[PDB]
């Protein structure tokens, strides 16, 4: 049946090439021989034999067979290398995680400068992303790695969230000890910079707000290489962490340790004056220092900016594929 | 989409082990020892109750597709617990699971691990994953026992006595094939039903509908008493066979 | 890691901007011509221009304006680089010693902002109270010109109008006032604001908004006699000032888009206007004086003067001499006469300044049978299209071959003693239903000619409607003699067929040498071409014969000869064709994991592919199997403009951000993943847009082979005419030259006080990185031009390495000899 994963062989896919590198193995693009559907294969190398099958992959197999949403990538099946006949101990073959192939990735399109977003395009983009995050957040799952690279976009304008390798369940009642350093520095929330270690689902919201700004500027909002320097960049725009705006900031491990140069005032509305007001309100709320005052995903979907957006009109972004090779004369 | 993990009692006479000449009593014994091995090892390591149960469910499912004569049970159990830890985010190093197993198993029993215990366990992970069809998410009677108990309103001491007795019945049902016959929601109701009979409590009064004598139908739809009685009979059989008695 | 060396063989020739003022002295009139990264200062004489000084800047010159604040004797120069380095410069001369003073400097980049579509704009107040900068959508930046602002500190005023087309400071206003054209969903408008340095905000402007032409492009600040502004569009020119409104819409300007404007008479009575087809117009302001004593603007008139080279910038200079600053063609000095000549023209050319124009493609060929290659470049566009033959002579000798149509690709066929050139000319839909060319050109003046009769796409049934006046490109293959450079034959391709690729080679067991062209069927409706041809031609006895055609399902962007087989890239696919004994192309194998296979290069059985995005991929042909294999791909996202193979392990690329990088095969083998990953080991900000990489050297070998420390030779051509050369170094030689750069940067004074390390840092809007693996040869070669005290200062405590001498001291004379050997590579 369709449900007996791990047995079908990777022979069933014609490998087209390597579309990227992944934590547990290299990622390949393949065409299904039977249906002709283009897929993506994630190679899981269990030959390491240090701790067996990588937990990062286990999380992606556990979570993505539960989550069904348009804005969440679908794992179609799991296939294997030709296994050694009747000798599992000799068998060192790897497993492949099949996913629906996506034409482009956000960071790729932005880095190549080949994409331009209108307000309506940003509306359609953010609505899908936040709706997917709401589905995941309602199922009490935390992504913990929201980056531009992990947002896959089809040419139709559909958005899907993808790398669930650092994803874990959130318990509101029982505060659970979590890994402190979980998102890439450019999209990391302030609590994790100050070392909360017991983060809320609001870590993912802060990231999506950083993306919201990036879609308007075409450049990441806070790009730094050191955790303190990131806090400084955030502090300049969002304001310095202080007890008045974040009453519990004093309980954070590094609040006394990590300090901005000054107690900067919030300037978000001023520095993003070119952003539309409906969006600017969303950004101010998504980039709130206090995780308890930071907006939820649902609250973003019930915003003036995203609520009356209709996803029937996908509004696909501007991806010129001709006369882009030629230079404007 | 998703696999079916439930068989009929009658289907258990045609497990791979039965067909290799193992008699029903022996496979049941092997299943209890393996499950209890998983439980004892994980408790020593400080593992969450869900992690222990997940390993036991992996274990029970495994030997619905393979024979006990070809796969030594304690190696299988250790592998299940090792994987369960990664699935449930309570991970342990394979070497540590092996160490704890050495303490609890005698020398003959540890012989199953062969000359290299860690390797025999790590090598099995491939077969375990393919066998469980990569359906790693498992639900256990515990969550439903608490979700349903929270909706009961009444004497705090009487309800808490119901919960703990039922909780013990859940821990005892992991040694059986009930996990392979009935969804966890039914098991949670069955153990509430059993404890209620034993404590002479009438749970209906604590539910929102006090004249609904089939109190469970508000938690689990379409469950006949036939089922709940079959489960109760199976749980109490473990107590009558052993020397242990009902907790009360 | 990898070590490479990059030098300029020819400096940028295209004119990016030109201003006139009194920069060297209050009495002299100067013309400051700006080329990319280069500033040229002249003095206007009666015969022409007198050069006085040229400087380089560590930045692309984006804004250049001359201003004279109260208290200064002479004009000061403001320059802003494309990386947002700002400075105010002063000319100072002490007898024979000429130097450039950095009076103020700083970097004005904002942490958060959206770069504007119409680019950086810089304007200065008529009272020189402030510098206005339009860098980001929705923001106006003010640098106030107070004596104390030596760091050029500035503030931003919120601008409601997000999409601004053009802005100027107006004349005759009570406060500093800006006039700008902006676009919102309702069309284009002209609006005014007043700028308050005291309040650091905008106040209501002197006159109300007016709706203007949809394609309103340029704003002219009319001088005090008239006041107000003139708005130039595609069809109309309008004057605005409070209640006064004029509009002239003469049919002559609708024909071609106007790109530049300049003031002739300081009173504002006359302006110069120029359009893309080269026509130069005079815009006349007809005055009317009222008995009140006030002069009003009565009417506007436009008069055609003649033809110049397509001009990016115009400057009136003095008398009738006008400087035509051309980026697409040769710049010029032309004289405006009061009386027309017998052809009706008032414009007569005086001098012609060489501009290698956009170098679309180039080839290195030893035409004169010497020891050196001559570089034949596809240069210029439209009526300025030319072929340029460049040979090393101390100056470069350049021969110009006018085509009057756009050249696209060039290849050399020695068997035929001729060159094959792809060209496109502009025709316009005319009343016949066909099209008519605006002027004769190479493809129409060929000795013999032919037109494709292919029936491949003839089935059509796809409608493409035509409106009178719309432009079309007509593509041709030109056969050009290598000695006379006479067009021997022109082959015109199908209607709507673009010629994108060209090769000259023999295939298989076929002894004939062919011209092979790859094309794309280009329809305005299509996002990406879905039809195309590979055409095999034979040039024989003065006639081009069509040998074979292969239909493809896309655009043949690139082709290259591969061991007797034809390697072609069709959209995403990279394909290898065999040439059968039946003289037809047969597909052997394909590779599909590409976004767009724009660029191809080969070496042995290895293929380097460069996509529109995802940088470069190393493919290999496995002859035992008859297929392609992915050896190693660069996973960093970059938009490619050109690629080249340096050696079997190093690969060179050019970004659309004016950056160069080198990727090396990891050459380790522990994991397969490591081999598959190409590590970018070189990063360099060139500052030019590289279209064509080409192995070869213009230097003539004295006898046999003489080699400096540099090994290998790659020439490259750019959009601004700059020609550069990339070569490799040993680890020992890199370290020596790198350590010396750091010493030279401490000694050499930069114009604008721009840090050299900053200038060469890799730069995309999203990422900025320090340069690596590249020696700025133009910095190294400047050691020979610094004074003796500075030379000895540089060599202090300098040690050699990785040689037979171990750690060797260096003297000023030792390094002078080393650099002079490096100057011989070009
Ligand atoms: C021909 O394209 C490539 C060639 C070479 C490289 C290096 C990249 C690309 N690609 C493939 C696209 C992608 O990332 N596709 C994807 N990645 C997935 C991960 C998980 C699930 C589905 C996925 N689909 C974006 C992109 O530029």
Residue numbers in the entry:
A (entry chain B): 715 to 1043
B (entry chain C): 20 to 267
C (entry chain A): 1 to 393, 708 to 1140
Article sentences:
Recently, several unexpectedly diverse compounds were reported to deplete cyclin K by linking CDK12–cyclin K to the DDB1–CUL4–RBX1 E3 ligase. Here, to investigate how chemically dissimilar small molecules trigger cyclin K degradation, we evaluated 91 candidate degraders in structural, biophysical and cellular studies and reveal all compounds acquire glue activity via simultaneous CDK12 binding and engagement of DDB1 interfacial residues, in particular Arg928. Crystallographic dissection of 28 ternary complexes demonstrated that despite considerable diversity of the molecular glues, the overall complex architecture is highly similar. The low-affinity DDB1–CDK12 interaction primes the complex, while the ligand, through filling the kinase pocket and bridging over to DDB1, drives robust association, offering a rationale for the unusually broad chemical diversity observed.
Interestingly, multiple other, small cyclin K degraders have recently been published. Structural evaluation of HQ461 (82), Z11 (83), Z7 (84), dCeMM3 (85) and Z12 (86) revealed that all promote the formation of an analogous ternary complex, and sustain the hinge hydrogen bonds and the π–cation interaction with DDB1 Arg928 (suboptimal for Z11 and dCeMM3; for HQ461 and Z11 we observe hydrogen bonding with the side chain instead), while also displaying interactions with additional residues. Those include CDK12 Tyr815 (hydrogen bonds for Z7 and Z11), Glu814 (CAr-H···O interaction for Z7, Z11 and dCeMM3), Phe813 (halogen bonds for Z7 and dCeMM3) and Ile733 (hydrogen bond for HQ461). Some compounds instead contact Arg928 via hydrogen bonding (for example, HQ461 and Z11) and hydrophobic interactions (for example, DS06). Small cyclin K degraders such as Z11 or HQ461 show less optimal engagement of the ATP pocket than CR8 derivatives. Accordingly, while CR8 displayed CDK IC50 values of 40–200 nM, the smaller compounds show weaker CDK association. DDB1–CDK12 complex formation and cyclin K degradation can thus be achieved with small, almost fragment-like compounds.
